Amino acid sequence: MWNVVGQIISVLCFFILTVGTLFGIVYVSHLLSRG
Amino acid sequence: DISKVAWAWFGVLLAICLIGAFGNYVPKLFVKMLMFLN
Amino acid sequence: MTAILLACLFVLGGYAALWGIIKFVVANTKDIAAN
Amino acid sequence: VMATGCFVGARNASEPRLGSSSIAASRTAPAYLREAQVLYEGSTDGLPKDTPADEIAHYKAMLAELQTRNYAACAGCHQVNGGGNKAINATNFQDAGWQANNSSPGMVTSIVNGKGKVMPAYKDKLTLQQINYLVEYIRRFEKKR
Amino acid sequence: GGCFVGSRDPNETRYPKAPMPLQNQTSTLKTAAQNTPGAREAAALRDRVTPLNLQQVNEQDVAGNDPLGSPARVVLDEGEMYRDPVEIYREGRALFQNNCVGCHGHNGCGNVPRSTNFTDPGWQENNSDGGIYSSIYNGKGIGNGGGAMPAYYNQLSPQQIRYLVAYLRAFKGRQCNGLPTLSDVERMVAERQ
Amino acid sequence: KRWYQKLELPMPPERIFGAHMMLIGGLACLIGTYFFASMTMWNDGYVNLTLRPRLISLGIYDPYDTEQIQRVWLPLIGEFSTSKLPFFGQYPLTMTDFRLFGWGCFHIGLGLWLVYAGAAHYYGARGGATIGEIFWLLPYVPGLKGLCQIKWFTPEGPWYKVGLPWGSFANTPWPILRRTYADALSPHTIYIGLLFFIWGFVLWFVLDKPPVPLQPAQVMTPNGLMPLEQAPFPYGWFDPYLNQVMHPMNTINGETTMCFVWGVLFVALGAYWWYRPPRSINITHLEDTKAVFHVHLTAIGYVSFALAIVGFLALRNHPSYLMLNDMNVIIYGKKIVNPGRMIHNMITFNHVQVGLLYVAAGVFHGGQYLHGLNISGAYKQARSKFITWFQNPDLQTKIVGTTMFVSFVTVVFGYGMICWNTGAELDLNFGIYQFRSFRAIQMDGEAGNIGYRVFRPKNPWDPTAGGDWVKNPDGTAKLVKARNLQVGDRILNEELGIGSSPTYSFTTIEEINYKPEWGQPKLYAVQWGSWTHFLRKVNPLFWVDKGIWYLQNQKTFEATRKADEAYLAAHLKAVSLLNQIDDAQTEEAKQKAQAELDKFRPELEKAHANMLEWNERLASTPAVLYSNLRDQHRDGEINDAIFFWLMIGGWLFGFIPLLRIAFHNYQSPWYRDFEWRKQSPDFPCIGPVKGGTCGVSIQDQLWFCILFSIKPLSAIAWYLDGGWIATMMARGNEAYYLTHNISHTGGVFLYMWNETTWIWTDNHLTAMLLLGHLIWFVSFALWFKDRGSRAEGGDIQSRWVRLMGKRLGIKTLQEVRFPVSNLATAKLWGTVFFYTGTFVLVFLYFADGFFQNR
Amino acid sequence: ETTWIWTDNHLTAMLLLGHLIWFVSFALWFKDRGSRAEGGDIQSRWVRLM
Amino acid sequence: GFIPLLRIAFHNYQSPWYRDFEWRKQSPDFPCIGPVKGGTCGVSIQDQLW
């Protein structure tokens, strides 16, 4: 009940950090190569 | 040449990072805030 | 019979689901071209 | 740059005796085997008459604490010298076939968990670092053939 | 690849064994051939060659889920365990050839680095039967699911581990050409198991 | 280039017809040989094993047949000189061997006859054809030239040499013949109806399996004549593996009654089309065989997929395959673990492969018909809605882009959850986060009296916390009995005997007195750590399966629940009494406490027996969707949820190139912006301009679909065979999987290693392993941007070799030029190599046997 | 050797990351850059529509 | 493994396949110039290094 909520919060953070990081790699790829 | 939008995303990912670290290394090396100790 | 019908319907609903999604995007972006 | 050193942590060791690094002791074969022999024998009696006063009494305090947790010493199942007891089926550490067909990593968990019926589990008695020391002492029992 | 497989050995009958019971061997619910021309020779022949406990076993019957399957509680009755060499051979060679050859070799002398070598006398003399059960049930070495010697407590039954234990003692003092035969098992059992 | 382009559509009807008829005859000959290879003197192999459960269900293969035969059709039948029944009179033959022989000979006789007749339609089309052009490597034999210059299948000839006397279907004046493919749709389905009747009559009267409801009261078995409902499986309806009478439509007598149901339906739908044949304007362009080829080939692919699903569920627990587990199946000298499920898995994965290959190819052949409409200027003129609905490029980019998004989100969810839980199972410290494993400790029964040392925090909820080891009143560390653990306690990892998690020290109790919803009937203290066990519920199929199942089993579910609740109360009161004992302090107070647990022991015993037996009953209820190796309910798992998300996302990943074939065979938005146009359907590129342009054509898009689809296809293979797909590193023997009664063979990577322990036991399987690995990586030589290097270097080699030939005198070496694959033929053969390399290795995963617990 | 590698959880994490870096090189080395450019373009149009 | 390095040393500007066509490699890192003559990907010096 409370473990579950705690676990959902860690998983959200992981998705925010890994997808977030991946898009930053694209943006950075974009700034180097061009604009 | 970064945007504000991007800086702000970068701050938000810096927060998750440090929040995570604090939880991992604070109870272990101080013996307090015992809910996150492992 | 029950499991066979469920599987089959779940695949058929996988296609029907997608079309509906696509139909929603088409209707709600009528008048925005995508150039 | 990267490994600025490398953050691997501090080493786990045994108990501290004043004035003599325990962490260091845990990598120095002659120190670790002196503690393994004490555990193995259940006494400080077979330790080199050259042993210091502080050492001889730290070992006794270690044993006295372990005696209150019903610890059973290794010698005398396995004897002071190896190669146990066929009666009790207690393993003979002097035997080369037994020694070749065991890895030291593997041996560890058989002491931790115990082994079938009689050889007892030591996971709640000893630390994993004290089991590592004992695996090293048992290695030195080997005879040829 | 296909069709030109050989002739089947006349000694391996296809005559069918009884089906594996639906009921769990650990159930508390209610517990645990003809005269047609060649049907009696075929049944007698299936009784020696075709194995009965080769199949993975019901999930409630695995040794970790069996109330009497832990190393501390299992019954290693030597009279039941070394009773019948046909049976030890029939069962343990099928289980061994399947599960254990990969890492211990086709000769059972060790394949994977540091792996056991069951022909070694020094290893034989210093292991109990109960000791051999412990290491199959627990695995050996530190790791998830056992170590380099993997654990079997989900996977095998207590009865399957016991055929394995008896079969493994037929390896003693053999040469490094494949597995113990029916007469290795029999000389092992005559010399008191 | 054109060697695989010899026969391209449109073709005329008589040539398609005739080649189908010839191929049908050819298949009937191969099946006939498979019937010969099924005879009992041979070893088990993969060919005869994939047909035996079906021949058992048909009555043709009889497992209990032992007698040897010496006279059966005519006086010459033990054994005899020049076989007496050639090459077979060496061995003892039984009646099933004779039944097999006969059905073999029947399939070879029909097949040869159909091959001949097909040839009559095919070559009598062209007005005949000479023997040396039919057989074509027959004029090379000398002193047999004259022989090969006769004309067979001529329009004119005497009866044993005619083809088509009128020359074509269109010219022959039989006024029953339909004249367009839509008009032919009606006779073709009456015809298929007739085939269904043939099969039903053969099953009823030749094989002796009449249709429900006309099945016999009695049937002959090896143990005598019994009543249908008690006679075991091949003979009667008693299922001896599951211990039940079979449903009538789960027998072969059910299949013979459907022979008549389906045959009546096809005859009536075909007679309806006879009178009102399809006529839409949206259909008329489909008379060109290039266009219909798309429709038919893609449909057929979908049919295969549905054969896989239907066959897998219907036959997963059927006695025809389980019967294999009772025979003594030995392949390349081994002995297979669960051959039943192995052959069942092979047949369904076979069909899934065929499914993919034909949907992908059918769409490619579709893109070829559309590309030709664009080349010839006719695309813009097309009148069918099935073309014009998709002509708008702004709609095409919205279709493709929203299926890319839906793919992105489902694959990120699935692959991200796999990554998360493999982190959790491995206990990985990232500095910013410590992943934690699942661990359990039993709290009830005898286990519940083992003690541990506990570090117990003071007040979890407030920071500036602190904790302390649990002590006695005098100050020594007291041992806490597992029955008395609480949420928040920490037990040292080393004392539980756990290595393998070196970056932290304690396991934490997160839930106490936990009873798995579906699993072992025990009580645990648990660390959940990072392990997402709730993710099994993030599956629509969990809920549908468990709901139907609850509705069907609701009384024993209710009695189970209530027996659990009574046992928990009784265990809780036992723990009180045991604790009063342990905390007595007065030999009198001890003795009296001990007296009261003694008189409560009986009735704790009773509550535990009651709970155990109700849980055993509940777990023996019949399956709905998710099943056991028996045919019993299992709850859905993390495995089943991940499979579910992976099928959605991964089939979109695989099928997006098919949409691109459909829309962008001629112009895509990249192309249109530069004003480009794809000039053929198979060019490799147009060079280095704009960054690089390799891989835009429809043949290349075809290869990409196939590679990308390798991924949902491996997820299916791993799932069929018993792998855990929800993590990468899972082992079968660990606490989560044993407490929840889960059997699996692996964990993505961990499966690869674990199954190969079994592969290694077979020398024929390992030789296949070596070779299939050699085939794959050579495909990289053909797919890399490297062909110029290879041609430049092959020119250096040619030159050198011709030098040697001049120096050495070797005329045949003096003009050598090594051929180097150009770009298109490289992408084709590289894809062929990549695909056959992978799926010879996947065959091995099925063929080592099936090792999930039963 | 990998049965020995599996007994260490740090080395099995390294094994997983190592495998992923490699097969992604295939995306970059196959004759496919035009396909990737023309699909990227569909992706950009779509995101701009959103 | 070293025959590509001899190709770098001798064929950085012209190989004998280039020289039959009159081609001339115009820089050390170009990806190709193909689909001509069946295709030319991988002749530059950078690629021979890879």
Ligand code: 2GO
């Ligand atoms: C494990 C024991 C043994 C060793 C010696 C071994 C080593 C190696 C090496 C090496 C030098 O060490 C290499 C280089 C190698 C190569 C290969 N092996 Zn290999 N190999 C072994 C054994 C096998 C076996 C039996 C098999 C391969 C198979 C294959 C294949 C792999 C073909 C391929 O490209 O496959 C992609 C598919 C994979 C990796 C399977 C994925 C399974 C998973 C359950 C899918 C679901 C989950 C994913 C995370 C994806 C979700 C998203 C999505 C659906 C869109 C090639 C020849 C092959 C295979 O996996 O094919 C799909 C196969 O069956 N191999 N292999």
Ligand code: CLA
């Ligand atoms: C099985 C592996 C294999 C083999 C044997 C080759 C062979 C070769 N490659 Mg290819 N290549 C490969 C894989 C392989 N490659 C991979 C995986 C890639 C992608 C990176 C490439 C990419 C590629 C490039 C870009 C180029 C080559 C080139 C070459 C040639 C080098 C010139 C030479 O030095 O002769 C020495 C010859 C040898 C050392 C090979 C002896 C042969 C083998 C081992 C016998 C082959 C067995 C074969 C698999 C079995 C099937 C036969 C069957 C009948 C039994 C050489 C013939 C160059 C070339 O010149 O093209 C013409 C070249 O430019 N390779």
Ligand code: CLA
């Ligand atoms: C990890 C493997 C991987 C992933 C995730 C992708 C992703 C993709 N490929 Mg590439 N590709 C791969 C490997 C991969 N490919 C390989 C091995 C090859 C050789 C055949 C190719 C060859 C190739 C071609 C020729 C083409 C693509 C295309 C695509 C895109 C399809 C459009 C779409 O479906 O949206 C859906 C998006 C998804 C389904 C994936 C979601 C993101 C994934 C799951 C995870 C991110 C994982 C990454 C490893 C994380 C590292 C992050 C960092 C923070 C750690 C998509 C972006 C097409 C395209 O349009 O180009 C842009 C395309 O044309 N692929």
Ligand SMILES: CC(C)CCCCCCCCCCCC(=O)OC[C@H](OC[C@H](C[N+](C)(C)C)C(=O)O)OC(=O)CCCCCCCCCCCC(C)C
């Ligand atoms: C599919 C198989 C079942 C085998 C197929 C049949 C043959 C099997 C046995 C091997 C046959 C090898 C024949 C090779 C040969 O002689 O090639 C000659 C050829 O063409 C040149 C002329 C024809 N101009 C060009 C005049 C029209 C000719 O000879 O006919 O070639 C090629 O150009 C292809 C390359 C063939 C490979 C030969 C290379 C041999 C290696 C020698 C290297 C080292 C030297 C010093 C010996």
Ligand SMILES: CNCCOP(=O)(O)O[C@H](COC(=O)CCCCCCCCCCCC(C)C)OC(=O)CCCCCCCCCCCC(C)C
């Ligand atoms: C070790 N034993 C594991 C299986 O145990 P067990 O017996 O408990 O349980 C059934 C699962 O086995 C299957 O039955 C798999 C057959 C595979 C052949 C069949 C595999 C084919 C799957 C889908 C095919 C897609 C094709 C046609 C595009 O477990 C199921 O619930 C599976 C149901 C499948 C339905 C999922 C619905 C998803 C929708 C897809 C949308 C796609 C598109 C939009 C493009």
Ligand SMILES: CNCCOP(=O)(O)O[C@H](COC(=O)CCCCCCCCCCCC(C)C)OC(=O)CCCCCCCCCCCC(C)C
């Ligand atoms: C000339 N410039 C113009 C265009 O050229 P273009 O690309 O058309 O031309 C050729 C030929 O078409 C083939 O591609 C032949 C195989 C087809 C049926 C095949 C006929 C014979 C082979 C298969 C059949 C053999 C069995 C059935 C007997 O150029 C090539 O592909 C040259 C490469 C082949 C040279 C051999 C390289 C290695 C040999 C194979 C070993 C690899 C293994 C490890 C898997």
Ligand code: HEC
């Ligand atoms: C299939 C079930 C079996 C059986 C019956 C056994 N094994 Fe193995 N094994 C492996 C390794 C690396 C060792 C050495 C362990 C160590 O010292 O480090 C072993 C050892 C054994 C033993 C001896 C145990 C003992 O304590 O002395 C026994 C009885 C044993 N094995 C039996 C390796 C592996 C495998 C590799 C992954 C596999 C699979 C098996 N073993 C399988 C089996």
Ligand code: HEC
């Ligand atoms: C008897 C009461 C014992 C005491 C005290 C100790 N051990 Fe033992 N051990 C005993 C028996 C009967 C056996 C045979 C086990 C079996 O196979 O059935 C053993 C075994 C060992 C082994 C060999 C293990 C292996 O895997 O092969 C070792 C390394 C071992 N024992 C070590 C050991 C140590 C270090 C002990 C004190 C700390 C110790 N044993 C106590 C009997 C008894």
Ligand code: SF4
């Ligand atoms: S490397 Fe090949 S596919 Fe790429 S642009 Fe050059 S010729 Fe075209």
Ligand SMILES: [Ca+2]
């Ligand atoms: Ca398998």
